[PDB]
């Protein structure tokens, strides 16, 4: 089986490179963030522009939804994160504490905590309600490219240009694991699988890898795309066939069969590097977003 993603909508409006796209957990919305300092909300099913959320002083590198789809958190070159109430557009809290650009962010599953990674080479854990920093982890020795909570929130995974993936105990801040393979390329992205058994990691040598983090073993590698320069998001697609989805520096979306590692589809249309992709939580829908020469978001739908 192969999917049949087809272009349905193109979303224009950001005035600079798009940095991140994410579907709300309730499936209704797509949030996007951009070098243009803005967050935009769009209908997930019709691509219809909903609203703009503004307030950051500098470009935004990441945005993420709370579990109940009510809140967003964003990470900006202004060295802050902001927590937003989506329905009102209000900035509820500005999270101050990183000493350099904040590059990546996520809520835990209970959405009472936020994790962030920064060019300051740290990972910070923040209290959502009070907005105050609970823990700072001296996590890495180069900028932190990605941060993600596991399924119950007891662990954090981080990745860095230092070539390392690390797994942290949320409660204690202790480094429980360092993952690295036979080479030391910068690691540009990581996340836990939906079931929380695995970690998917991107490295800037054109490779994605699926790790059993419990065993410290690399189980699968995905190759064929181009990724040497940018921190490109990758995903597990689980609504239909089980795929791996990623952007690429050849302006395409790549889809692999998770088990076989064969490329099953490539999606053409963007005119610049596809920096970010996201997968709809219940429908076979992919959003993709491209860099400065393109500035658009595209929504693709498949029968499986």
């Amino acid at each position: 089986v192969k999917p049949n993603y087809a272009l349905k909508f193109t979303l224009a409006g950001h005035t600079k490179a798009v940095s991140s796209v994410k579907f709300s957990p309730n499936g209704e919305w797509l949030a996007s963030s951009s070098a243009d300092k803005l967050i935009k909300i769009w209908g997930a099913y019709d691509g219809k522009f909903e609203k703009t959320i503004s307030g950051h002083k500098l470009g935004i590198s990441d945005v993420a939804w709370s579990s109940d789809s009510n809140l967003l958190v964003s990470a900006s070159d202004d060295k802050t994160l902001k927590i937003w109430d989506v329905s009102s557009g209000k900035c509820l809290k500005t999270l101050k504490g990183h000493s350099n650009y904040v590059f990546c962010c996520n809520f835990n599953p209970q959405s009472n905590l936020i994790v962030s990674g920064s060019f300051d080479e740290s990972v910070r854990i923040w209290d959502v309600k009070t907005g105050k920093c609970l823990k700072t982890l001296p996590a890495h020795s180069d900028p932190v490219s990605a941060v993600h909570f596991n399924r119950d929130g007891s662990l954090i995974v981080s990745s860095s240009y230092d070539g390392l993936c690390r797994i942290w105990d949320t409660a204690s801040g202790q480094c429980l694991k360092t993952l690295i393979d036979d080479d030391n390329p910068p690691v540009s992205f990581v996340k836990f699988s939906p079931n929380g058994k695995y970690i998917l990691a991107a490295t800037l040598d054109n490779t994605l890898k699926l790790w059993d983090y419990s065993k410290g073993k690399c189980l699968k590698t995905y190759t064929g795309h181009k990724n040497e320069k940018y921190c490109i998001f990758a995903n597990f697609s689980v609504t239909g066939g089980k795929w791996i989805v990623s952007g690429s520096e050849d302006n395409l979306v790549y889809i692999w069969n998770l088990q076989t590692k064969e490329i099953v589809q490539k999606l053409q249309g963007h005119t610049d590097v596809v920096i970010s992709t996201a997968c709809h939580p219940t429908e076979n829908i992919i959003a993709s977003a491209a860099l400065e020469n393109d500035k658009t978001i595209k929504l693709w739908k498949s029968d499986c």
């Binding site: 600079k16 798009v18 070098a35």
Partner: peptide, 4 residues
């Protein structure tokens, strides 16, 4: 920054 991601976009650079």
């Amino acid at each position: 920054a991601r976009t650079k």
